[PDB]
């Protein structure tokens, strides 16, 4: 009944506990190392999402935001699938995609002993090859064979490290690249929440999209070709219309990206007081200035809408993270965890575990000021100031303009012009960039002393007498990239000396020199920490056991289980476990592009045309939440019944659960799942694509 | 659900016990004796209060006693921010222009008033609602020398049910009410602006006073010979607390409701009153917000003004939400349609005609009422220099006339009003930008022929440029800046003052303001007279039990249950909030959500004493299904035994439309827990003498 991201190898140790939570299905029907199981119906979608096979003709279900770029690619102004939706009424009408892939995890094997054996060919006791993917791939190819490439078309092999390098798994992957768009709801449904309901529970978003795997006649992976035939999968999920109740058993298979549950207390402090605090501070200034300019000018708004929203993402994540640190007591539990290992190690008579923790603590404290300057210049200038990424003449661009007689002279200018036009594009505003720069630079100059500044920015004190505005003004005034006309003047009569002394080029070069210097000075602190973490985790595994703890996520297939349950976000407030179509209508706002409601959906609601998709009360469910443990990567993970029947599609996590990447939050962290009944409702009543329903296997 | 008269207690008493009341009727209200009613007061003519001890202790809201706490707040031993606690009865601070009113007696005088009324000539006379006429009727029935023969007592007659019911009130008024105790503003106004009209709420909204009188308990103005009043009745304070579905009841003075509005009056309310208020204030607040964020002292200068505007703005939003989602218009349409069908089968068309008369009057005044709200919200309340100083008749004649140093008298009188106008919280540049935005909207909605005479210069003298018009006003004007005033003050000439673009503006927007008012008021009487027939029809058709008369600042009682509600899909607000919520909302950088140091220490140490509930969590506030409105602030909340379990101080925004129609699934009275009040007095105020003097039932 533990909450984590468990390896498929751990199903045996957890199976009895899962039955106690309500699992009524048989273990090897879920995962079988030596046979067909439900795992075979789960896929890694396009490298970053999760998907699931739903029919015996290769039908694949994933999120709408996962298939977003592909729907957009097949969308034109006249025939807009991104806003109207797409529904191929026959298999021939399904749209092929380029740069798309789907990956089955066919076989998983423990190769810890094999890897460790190959590692005792020691060159250096503190070599980092045990975490090197390049090195592990060589070990992977060695065990698989010389040209496993040709002997098994469509199959590839990979070795990954777990538990800081104390466990190694080999994966046999099956990769299909002919995956075509089948079905998609309108943006008003799949993206109903948009950005204001992002990371928010309750939620009413029909976040899904439908695809199909194609292959050759035998079902072997093949690139796009009109002679390809829909894949007949080894296994596919059954659809359940039985729905969910409060406290119902729920489980999830998917590919969680990254977690850091084995952070020391000092690493939590570092994450809070340096990484998050600087990011929050610098971005609040940047977004503040940016917001002000967007409201005052509707044209600035359409240009900086994406940049603003993008900056907000990691900003909100850092806010939620620090909230978890302060109120959930994440630092204290890590501190209790390592203290418990130290006390255990002392009793055992092995001091190496305490020594490893001390090694980490001392290293974190040592690099604090360097890491501070790094994040300050990364958040402040590198990310915060647009003209920091202004064009910088390469070495061979300089030589070609300098004493170089050939008129490749001109070719170098064309390359520079291209980079300038991308910098000063249709969304770029110098006036807005200037105001942002002045605010960001003022804060940066406040926090960073003269001796540690990049070698420009010193001129604010030496040349501009502390006037940041005049410093920024002088840059755009006398530069080549200051405006279109100033660049054309340079392009007409180009000289290496004019670029060498260019105020903006000097800035961009100076801030990037310092950026790389701090980076090179911080990097040798990583290896001693990693080696100590290997010892640390090894001790934790030996002490607490290998059953009631799980390795950090690493884009590897994991399973998680829990119950359908709401939670209390704050005093006197409780969020329930299931949202309804009623909630969609309550949020309807014609003037807001986010909360626009599709006409067909509202008609279905008002006519109560829900068929067999509604519950007993007669209400139409939209989404529900569960106590399962998920993170980025579980984007489109299948949510299963007690009998392994598909009951929903995971698509998000509430913002309170962002601390879950460090420590699972039982009373606050919730997986946000769209009800499969609502999915089938959209397909039936909105899409009208009946062929997809007949294709699926639906249980009572 | 009902704001019932005290006379209707007999009818409801059965239902009240059916829903949980276990208290004898005549102890609640006794028409011919002492009851719990005698412990309820009208506080300072606006709020409600209650007598808490046998030495005249009075509890009310913090926002009710706000003016009085500040009035005693010096330069820097400020009670408004730190709190106030008199450690003995001798340093309890008297307040002038304060009052406390007991409702000593209530009697029905309907037939008396009506037969007096069937003695007036004009059938359309409005004397049946005239306070002057009704008072003269009251003086007649009470006797000529009533006040002289009854010390401290006065008499008053009020109209109910649109003039179909008249009650006579005998009032005992005390004017010596001293300030006793008050929590810090951080507690008394914790919700402040962000959480106003909002549940859950974590505001300890209370303040403490005491009634003083002469040697015999009779009313008397402020005197140091005055002795604390020994009341004939005061509330017992319960520490048993509340649970979900617990019976709860309230006595107080609800100000105004509009239960008997027609469908058209609802449409008028939304499309004109609320929509214009919402639209205009959104524009004004938007400009203010931009300027406040840009300059930190502008933020200081316009913090209060911005907040004040948001108050009715938020209420308007809540009201229109109810109209759109709860279908208030449809319910009124059905209500009047029933009377029409009922009146038809009886051969009585007078009810249908009354409804049409109301609709016709609303229709005809539609354009005029739109212009009124447009200029009131847009300019009178929307633009600051609209209230710039205007030269009166006696200062015009002085500067002009040329015959004294009374000329210079007039100047300093004008200078005084200008300084008050252009004070420390006033910014000419901010007022400039606000004006341009407001006038831009106003000139769009109001045609040239209906403009204030000065505003039509934006087209005539200027090229439609509102900015240039506003710029020209602040330039050239005597009141445009301090330097431009002193120049006038040195060389005062009336022909210049009479041609001032700022004076012309302010005068022409106000005479238009008054012109519309005087033109709209004759429309009130037909609706009123028709409303009398309408309500009389509704009463005769359905009865005297499930329809309450509109609130009119008279003593009412309402009853319900301690229970939360679901504001939206998959969301539920519980019935009771706790001290945990205060800490969850804490933000030291925001003055609204600043948690008091002592209060914070109390929470950390779990030092709750007997004031905690059976779980170990400290209660702060709860909500009930009672039916309250503006005026019910500071009202006593009673349990099943008539014991005080808290003070009402607000109402959730989802229940704003309750003045038109009670919403059982949304409308809730927001009530501070009496346990939390005693906690603040004890572990924060350190005023134990207040605890001991009260009668606390453990």
Author numbering:
A (entry chain A): 21 to 720
B (entry chain B): 23 to 720
From the publication, what sentences describe this entry?
Here, we show that dipeptidyl peptidase 11 (DPP11), a central metabolic enzyme in these bacteria, undergoes a conformational change upon peptide binding to distinguish substrates from end products. As previously reported, the overall fold of DPP11 comprises a bilobal architecture. The upper helical domain dictates the specificity of the enzyme and caps the catalytic domain, which has a typical chymotrypsin double β-barrel fold. The active site of DPP11 lays in a wide cleft running through the middle of the protein between the catalytic and helical domains, which contributes to the formation of the substrate binding subsites.
We determined the structures for the inactive constructs PgDPP1122-720 S655A, PeDPP1122-717 S652A and its complexes with the dipeptides Arg-Asp and Arg-Glu, as well as the substrate Leu-Asp-Val-Trp, at 2.4, 2.85, 2.2, 2.1 and 2.6 Å resolution, referred to as PgDPP11, PeDPP11, PeDPP11:RD, PeDPP11:RE and PeDPP11:LDVWs, respectively. PeDPP11 and PgDPP11 superposition yielded a root mean square deviation (r.m.s.d.) of 1.4 Å for 629 out of 685 superimposed Cα-atoms. The binding of peptides to PgDPP11 induces the dimerization of its monomeric population, masking the real thermodynamic contributions involved in the binding process. In this way, we focused our thermodynamic analysis solely on PeDPP11. Indeed, P. gingivalis dpp11-knock-out strain shows growth impairment, suggesting its critical role in the bacterium energy metabolism.
